[PDB]
Amino acid sequence: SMAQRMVWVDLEMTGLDIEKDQIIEMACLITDSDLNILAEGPNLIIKQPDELLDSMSDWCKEHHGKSGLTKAVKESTITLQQAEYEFLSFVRQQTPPGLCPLAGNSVHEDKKFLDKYMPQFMKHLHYRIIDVSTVKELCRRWYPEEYEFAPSHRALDAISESIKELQFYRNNIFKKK
Amino acid sequence: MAAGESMAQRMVWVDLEMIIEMACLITDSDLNILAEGPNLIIKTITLQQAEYEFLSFVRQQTPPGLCPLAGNSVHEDKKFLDKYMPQFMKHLHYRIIDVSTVKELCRRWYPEEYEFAPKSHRALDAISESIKELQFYRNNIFKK
Ligand SMILES: [Mg+2]
Ligand SMILES: [Mg+2]
């Protein structure tokens, strides 16, 4: 039951460089094994210095500017430690320790950034992941017709769409019972 | 399909076992093995030479940036390779085909079929087992 819950997480960062870039937005949801959303967790924008934001890549600067994320990061007073406190408290109240997997689209990158910057949060979770993008690639290869009809760079919207994408895959390309 | 799409839908299967043994091969979109790559030992050669070997192989086998890494819990292997074989990883897509994801989905949604699924320490045998496991999943829990 609770051991089969999933911890869905999406991150927005200043870039892909794990050695230099930081987390600027994070959202978390808790679903059961049937993808029913059980709990909506914190949706936080994490304060980061102005120099890193002004030094972002062209893709990151353009997109995080058009979405208003850069201005929100400039506006935020939430540190990385406070964000980890909130997320750790949420998952500790929602999941049993060490049994539930991270979930999302290409969530291995999010797992890299969380292992580096939120290690206690990741210590609460299982080591396996549920990568929706794996199912996406398998659907693109084996079910192109269904893939064509499958369903803002902000964390909450992205993770909601990830859950819906996996639900579409289960409804359309997995064996009916 | 259009010319080149079947090649763009190939998979680069890799496995690493800890002295580190590393093996790699290529499958088509239907999991048929097309070519076997190097099977190397790194700390009988150096990391840079082994990276060159694997990169030359995947250059001969997949178009740049289009094909994903594949394997069981391949995210850990990708974490290692992004740091120690970055030129090899730059040839690959950023998405992965994690057989462990399908394994978890089968355990949750198809437990009866899950009890029948396939489950040495050499990397090539691990790749073979991962391919057979994904094929079992396609045969038994995916839409006919
Ligand atoms: Mg995402
Ligand atoms: Mg996003």
Numbering used by the authors:
A (entry chain B): 38 to 188, 193 to 218
B (entry chain A): 33 to 50, 60 to 84, 114 to 189, 193 to 217
Q: Which sentences did the original study use to describe this structure?
A:
Human RNA exoribonuclease 2 (Rexo2) is an evolutionarily conserved 3′-to-5′ DEDDh-family exonuclease located primarily in mitochondria. Rexo2 degrades small RNA oligonucleotides of <5 nucleotides (nanoRNA) in a way similar to Escherichia coli Oligoribonuclease (ORN), suggesting that it plays a role in RNA turnover in mitochondria. Rexo2 forms a homodimer and interacts mainly with the last two 3′-end nucleobases of substrates by hydrophobic and π−π stacking interactions via Leu53, Trp96, and Tyr164, signifying its preference in binding and degrading short oligonucleotides without sequence specificity. Rexo2 contains four strictly conserved DEDD residues (D47, E49, D147, D199) for binding two metal ions, as well as a general base (H194) in the active site for hydrolysis of the phosphodiester bonds in nucleic acid substrates.
We obtained three complex cocrystals, referred to as Rexo2–RNA (Rexo2–D199A bound with a 12-nt U12 RNA and Mg2+), Rexo2–DNA1 (wild-type Rexo2 bound with a 5-nt T5 DNA), and Rexo2-DNA2 (Rexo2–D199A bound with a 10-nt T10 DNA and Mg2+). In the Rexo2–RNA complex, we used the inactive D199A mutant for cocrystallization with RNA in the presence of Mg2+. D199 is one of the metal-ion binding residues in the DEDDh active site, but we still identified two Mg2+ ions in the active site, one bound to Glu49 (A site, MgA) and another bound to Asp47 and Asp147 (B site, MgB). However, several regions in protomer A were disordered, including residues 51–59, 85–114, and 190–193, in the Rexo2–RNA structure. As a result, the RNA substrate was modeled only in the active site of protomer B, but not modeled in protomer A due to the ill-defined electron density. In the Rexo2–RNA and Rexo2–DNA1 complexes, only the last two 3′-end nucleotides were observed, i.e., U–U in Rexo2–RNA and T–T in Rexo2–DNA1, with the remainder of the substrates being disordered. RNA-specific interactions are observed in the Rexo2–RNA complex, where the 2′-OH (O2′) of the ribose group of the 3′-end nucleotide forms a hydrogen bond with the Met50 backbone (O atom). This interaction likely facilitates product release for nucleoside monophosphates, so RNA is cleaved more efficiently than DNA. We propose a hydrolysis mechanism for Rexo2 activity, based on comparison of the structures of the two active sites in the Rexo2–RNA and Rexo2–DNA1 complexes. Thus, Rexo2 hydrolyzes the phosphodiester linkage from the 3′-OH end by means of a two-Mg2+-ion-dependent catalytic mechanism.
